[PDB]
Amino acid sequence: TTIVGVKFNNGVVIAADTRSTQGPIVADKNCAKLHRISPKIWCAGAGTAADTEAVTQLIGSNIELHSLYTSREPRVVSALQMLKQHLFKYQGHIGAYLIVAGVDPTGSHLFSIHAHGSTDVGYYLSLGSGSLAAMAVLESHWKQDLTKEEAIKLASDAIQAGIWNDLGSGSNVDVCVMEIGKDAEYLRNYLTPNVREEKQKSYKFPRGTTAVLKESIVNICD
Amino acid sequence: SDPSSINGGIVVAMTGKDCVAIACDLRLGSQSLGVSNKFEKIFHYGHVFLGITGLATDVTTLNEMFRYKTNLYKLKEERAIEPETFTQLVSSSLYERRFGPYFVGPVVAGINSKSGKPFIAGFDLIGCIDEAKDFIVSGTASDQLFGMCESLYEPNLEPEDLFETISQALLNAADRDALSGWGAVVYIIKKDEVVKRYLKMRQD
């Protein structure tokens, strides 16, 4: 997995690849690593797929209840604090590595959370197996005062570095742009540079090829 | 002593044009020893079909657990659970046992009764959801099934064609795995009819 976060003047952008693996086998060629904690707080997850999804949904649920209780739009630091306290409690046994980003009344924010419960602040971050490929691109091209269109380009370029050079990462690039004073736009399959080429042959079998012992109608109704 | 490969077995699910197919082998063994050639791994709660590979005691336990949960669901909701919702229930239930998991590879298949959309999904033992347009594979011959499905499969197959494709995918994958085979079952699922076919395959 390759996930990045990039800050620009009026917001923050997070991107991710779409490959899920079971050992050396690709389980999902187009899985979604970008999770909505709250409408304007989004999360990118690497590590144990279930752990990143479960911890994202739990804090997302508690943040919604907190938002309704306080009659206030949720803050990134709240999601960050609740996540890192939960992850610390389980002493790294919940294998969730997350880039938490969003806009709130306080402004735009970008954090990373490691499974043991450490948090980092930055203008650009990368996590996962392809983080070193991505961080190489970020360290080469990142500058202060990026525009929206520049930050999307930099973020997607950093993911592509992971897709091509890291065996853990591949397929497509998902992006989410969180700009201040605007609705967050989730760009599912923003880039699809790994389309499967036309097969040489159709393997559609002549009907009756498979040998059958028994047939029966199944009753699904009451 | 690897729970997922004591009993052995495989499940595969595919989508066609306004139809889904789910298929499984019939073997239950104790490592090398074949014990039962009647052990079905596909169950159904209304119009939602669930295949489960892995440790056979957990296959049985989870079937009994989901029957229990879908029965209470129907009594309270006054309607049959839909595939998308059941998928979420499976995921919740597996992750509840995060640090003591069921050693299983479940596969949900069925057609949403409202939208008429074909739906399939797979899970790891910890409850992570693997949603797919094309096909889901599970079991001791998952590598073999991935190879067969990825080559044989094409989109928008008619029920009668889809039957041939899934059957050949399962049979040829099972014959390259020691712990899988000993008979097979294929469910062809249309909007309001379901055909169940037992395949003739080599018995070694």
Partner: peptide, 4 residues
């Protein structure tokens, strides 16, 4: 497990 499935990793990302």
């Amino acid at each position: 497990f499935l990793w990302x």
